[PDB]
Amino acid sequence: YQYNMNFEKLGKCIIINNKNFDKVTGMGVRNGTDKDAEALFKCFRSLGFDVIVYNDCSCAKMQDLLKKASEEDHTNAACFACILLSHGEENVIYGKDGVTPIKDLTAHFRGDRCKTLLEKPKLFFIQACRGTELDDGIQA
Amino acid sequence: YQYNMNFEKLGKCIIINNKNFDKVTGMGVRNGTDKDAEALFKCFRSLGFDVIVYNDCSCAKMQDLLKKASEEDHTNAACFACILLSHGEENVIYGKDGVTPIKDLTAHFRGDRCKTLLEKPKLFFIQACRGTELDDGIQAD
Amino acid sequence: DLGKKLLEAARAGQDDEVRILMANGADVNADDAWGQTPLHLAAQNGHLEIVEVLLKHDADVNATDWVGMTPLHLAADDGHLEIVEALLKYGADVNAYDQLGNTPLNLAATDGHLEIVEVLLKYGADVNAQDKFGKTAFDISIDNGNEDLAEILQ
Amino acid sequence: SDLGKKLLEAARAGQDDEVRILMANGADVNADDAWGQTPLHLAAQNGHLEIVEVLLKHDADVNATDWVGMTPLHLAADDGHLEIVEALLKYGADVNAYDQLGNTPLNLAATDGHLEIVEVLLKYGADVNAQDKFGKTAFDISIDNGNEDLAEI
Amino acid sequence: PRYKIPVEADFLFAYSTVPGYYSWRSPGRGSWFVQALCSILEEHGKDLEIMQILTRVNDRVARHFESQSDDPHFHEKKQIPCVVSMLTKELYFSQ
Amino acid sequence: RYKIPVEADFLFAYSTVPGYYSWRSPGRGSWFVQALCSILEEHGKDLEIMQILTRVNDRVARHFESQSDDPHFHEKKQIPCVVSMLTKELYFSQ
């Protein structure tokens, strides 16, 4: 009933911290995201992850990083984690220069494409808008 | 950290069992679905739900039942469950006469629309295709 | 509790069990959380002899459930000719509307059940009844291309 | 080494005293984390000039590359740490290093408009014709960002 | 006096399959997902939390089912269900 | 001989449900991350991943409410969204 944790390493965790966006996108600065990235760096490292943080990534750079991350040798890791902090819309996330489908980023880690993570948990934490609807809430 | 179960009833469970489809849709028979609905009727009854099964519902009939189910008084129920068994596509499910958005069905149970289920778990189990993609699988070598 | 076993015996079609439960004084008009009676459950699952024993034992022929459906509604929908007849002989409301805008005639028209339509008409089914979509029995018969039924409805 | 690890963290956080202490105690200056980043990588990236310099004097590999081939100079050039860039160059950092993503220090520096950094890189022989993954040189990048001063140089 | 609940809170969707994918059903035995769900619930429905159950369901569908067909296109395919939770507490079916 | 679905063993922890805005405090950071770190710091090595993400859901839902001088953006709420294709229980216990 439990994923095997008996590995040399808990695993790698990559954080994409997007704060500043090219004027062409029309997107504002994401103030507070640095605090997010720093708090996440500490929590995840405390759990046992090897964490690395990349700031203000273009779409191409996010793509290359996640692809490259999937091509690392995870044989001696129990799992893998990716954290994305950025603006977003439905099904997509902003690099500094525009939007990229979230599914394209995660595709590199599919069982047939990333063998050393096969049968291991692949975790994606995604802080981004997914559309413009607002929850007005309701009182009991 | 746990949903309150201290209620008179576990709650209602409505099952939509769509087996036969109008010739106009071009969809085939879902053989084996009757066994699904009967086994689910037994399991969910065993948990404590009051279960009802509706067979071969049109889109309009599915919409109305779920809307009506949301208008029941759930004051004395711990939760609510809905089971959909049908053909499907992306974001969508088949009635006997065509396709309806899954979100239209669940919308009736939103916190602001269904007061007596507020802060209670609303459970939807959905057996349907969500597109045409096939998982080829991979061997652990 | 005796009623629960009766509801289940009826759903099941357990004839002998139904008869035993009747003999032990089970409430014939017992209803479950969805307001369905043993008559509802027997009628729906095609259990004719149970339907008849229930009827002869003073079951409410016009009991309505949580969405206003009568046993006749369910029988017409599922195509149970003899059950429909049995229900009608005991005073089933032939023109009853449920909360979804269904009438027995329109249900039978929808699924092409010719004999049932004829029996309902014989018991005074309202041929002008409107489904929520404003469609009558005849309208439904054309849209499904069932011309023989359209002929009956005239 | 636990000491190699403590050195890595001290260097990232900018703990000057902690860094010197670990060095005197025999900590590996070229210690490597799971992403192939060295204390020099982490100090360079986070603007810790005095830590960069103490590491350099203790024979840190100035051209150590991490998991995507980035050197401490790449990281410093990107973040605009002028003095760190110079310290690295003075200790023989490869001015023309390509990382695995097609970045050069010059092109990194050009992108963010770091004029002084560009000038230092040029002085150390940076290839003005180097192309990024999209075929752009430092000059192409300077125009697209509207940096008229950088375009002049 | 004030606390509001998100109108979207406290739903759980247990899909038989991931977005974009086919969902397999045996004409004689029923759907892979329902078969597995009933099996797990029968054994553990009154003991485990809802997410524990659906995780075992995921595992059961993933390991123990594989399509069979004379159509090479449909032969030896696999399935994983898909749980979407907006639940705010643990759910045990207990009473 | 046994194949694994290629889509198996992923988990997506979204800060919000599909179609909705996701709230962020300019000074404190995003609601979801604040809550996640708080939970992980206190319970990260003790609870299963789903218990953790559920408490995160609860924290965001109960303890945050937007504030704005723009009535359109004032007093709004948020619920995150966990998507699991996991086939086992996940404890961070290595």
Swiss-Prot record, chain A:
Region annotation Loop L2: where it falls in the sequence: 130-139
Biological classification of the source: Eukaryota, Metazoa, Chordata, Craniata, Vertebrata
Residues represented out of the complete protein: 58 to 197 of 303
Domain of life: Eukaryota
Site (Involved in allosteric regulation) location in chain: R130
Residues bearing the modification Phosphothreonine: T116
Impact noted for substituting R130 to M/A/G: Reduced thiol protease catalytic efficiency
Segments for region (Loop L1): 19-30
Effect of R130K: Does not significantly affect thiol protease catalytic efficiency
Coiled-coil residue spans: none
Name used for this protein in its record: Caspase-7 subunit p20
Enzyme active site: H87, C129
From Swiss-Prot, chain E:
Effect of mutating C82 to T/N: Does not significantly affect thiol protease catalytic activity
Annotated site residue numbers, Involved in allosteric regulation: Y15
Taxonomic source organism: Homo sapiens (Human)
Effect recorded for S31A: Abolished phosphorylation by PAK2
Region (Loop L3) residue spans: 18-30
Protein name: Caspase-7 subunit p11
Region called Loop L4, residue ranges: 66-80
Chain positions found as Phosphoserine: S31
Signal peptide range in chain numbering: none
Domain of life: Eukaryota
Sites of (Microbial infection) ADP-riboxanated arginine modification: R25
